[PDB]
Amino acid sequence: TTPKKNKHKRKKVKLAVLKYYKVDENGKISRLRRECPSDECGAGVFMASHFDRHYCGKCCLTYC
Amino acid sequence: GVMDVNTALQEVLKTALIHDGLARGIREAAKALDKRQAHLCVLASNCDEPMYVKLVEALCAEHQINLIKVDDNKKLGEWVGLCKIDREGKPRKVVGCSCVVVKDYGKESQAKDVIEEYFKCKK
Ligand SMILES: [Zn+2]
């Protein structure tokens, strides 16, 4: 009846590593969200801790 | 040593594109140092975010990165080639990114005679 056209556009924060990386005045680098244990996104690429899980950007892994 | 050191970051960031050794961006520039293979990194002084410099210098400090101070954001991004040049040579649209890193130097001696000698006197 009615053409339902929709596409989930992306909304990026101002360089969203500031949501990940926190450094205080002493200079230690504190990352709040989860680092993915998979090797293709290891030690540089982080997951995002959600309300019931975490979510990777590459291998899309979940948690509880 | 014939040329100025703030105009000596030209050709090393040219040859940062011949292997795409320039990790352009900021998140990609953050993850460029997370694997610990980058040789040099520079930063623009023109920042709206003051704590952004505190984020990037925290990783540049403890992972032995020497820095070169450049004043402007949009001036820095043209060494990637991100300025949209015209057919007669005018950058009609310039993209500036404040985190320019390198992964490979050039194959010469006219670049590391002034950059590295300016690096030795700050040790
Ligand atoms: Zn991955």
From Swiss-Prot, chain A:
Q: Which residues carry this modification: N6-acetyllysine?
A: 19, 28
- What post-translational changes are documented for it? Monoubiquitinated at Lys-22 and Lys-28 by RNF25 in response to ribosome collisions (ribosome stalling): ubiquitination promotes subsequent activation of RNF14, leading to EEF1A1 ubiquitination and degradation and rescue of stalled ribosomes. Deubiquitination at Lys-28 by USP16 is required for maturation of the 40S ribosomal complex.
Q: Where in the cell is it found?
A: Cytoplasm; Nucleus, Nucleolus
Query: What are the residue ranges of zinc fingers typed C4-type?
Result: 36-59
Q: Where is this cross-link: Glycyl lysine isopeptide (Lys-Gly) (interchain with G-Cter in ubiquitin)?
A: 22, 28
**Effect after changing residue 22 to R:** Abolished monoubiquitination by RNF25, leading to impaired ability to rescue stalled ribosomes
Q: What does this protein do?
A: Component of the 40S subunit of the ribosome. Part of the small subunit (SSU) processome, first precursor of the small eukaryotic ribosomal subunit. During the assembly of the SSU processome in the nucleolus, many ribosome biogenesis factors, an RNA chaperone and ribosomal proteins associate with the nascent pre-rRNA and work in concert to generate RNA folding, modifications, rearrangements and cleavage as well as targeted degradation of pre-ribosomal RNA by the RNA exosome.
How is this protein organized at the quaternary level? Part of the 40S ribosomal subunit. Part of the small subunit (SSU) processome, composed of more than 70 proteins and the RNA chaperone small nucleolar RNA (snoRNA) U3.
What is the name listed in the Swiss-Prot or TrEMBL entry for this protein? Small ribosomal subunit protein eS31
| Full protein: residues contained | 86 to 149 of 156
Swiss-Prot record, chain B:
Give one GO biological process term: ribosomal small subunit biogenesis
Q: Where in the cell is it found?
A: Cytoplasm; Nucleus, Nucleolus
Ribonucleoprotein: present as a keyword of the record? yes
Return the InterPro entries for the record: Ribosomal_eL30-like_sf, Ribosomal_eL8/eL30/eS12/Gad45, Ribosomal_eS12, Ribosomal_eS12_CS
Name the major location: cytoplasm
GO CC, sorted alphabetically, is: cytoplasm; cytosol; cytosolic ribosome; cytosolic small ribosomal subunit; Golgi apparatus; intracellular membrane-bounded organelle; membrane; nucleolus
Q: Sites of the modification N6-succinyllysine?
A: 120
One Pfam family per UniProt: Ribosomal_L7Ae
Q: Which SUPFAM superfamilies match?
A: L30e-like (SSF55315)
Keyword line: Acetylation, Cytoplasm, Nucleus, Ribonucleoprotein, Ribosomal protein
Could you confirm whether the keyword DNA damage appears in this record?
no
Residues crossing the lipid bilayer are none
Record function comment: Part of the small subunit (SSU) processome, first precursor of the small eukaryotic ribosomal subunit. During the assembly of the SSU processome in the nucleolus, many ribosome biogenesis factors, an RNA chaperone and ribosomal proteins associate with the nascent pre-rRNA and work in concert to generate RNA folding, modifications, rearrangements and cleavage as well as targeted degradation of pre-ribosomal RNA by the RNA exosome. Subunit of the 40S ribosomal complex.
According to the record's subunit comment, the protein's assembly and interactions are: Part of the small subunit (SSU) processome, composed of more than 70 proteins and the RNA chaperone small nucleolar RNA (snoRNA) U3. Subunit of the 40S ribosomal complex.
Q: What family does this chain come from, according to its entry?
A: Belongs to the eukaryotic ribosomal protein eS12 family.
Can you say what this protein is called? Small ribosomal subunit protein eS12
Species the sequence originates in: Homo sapiens
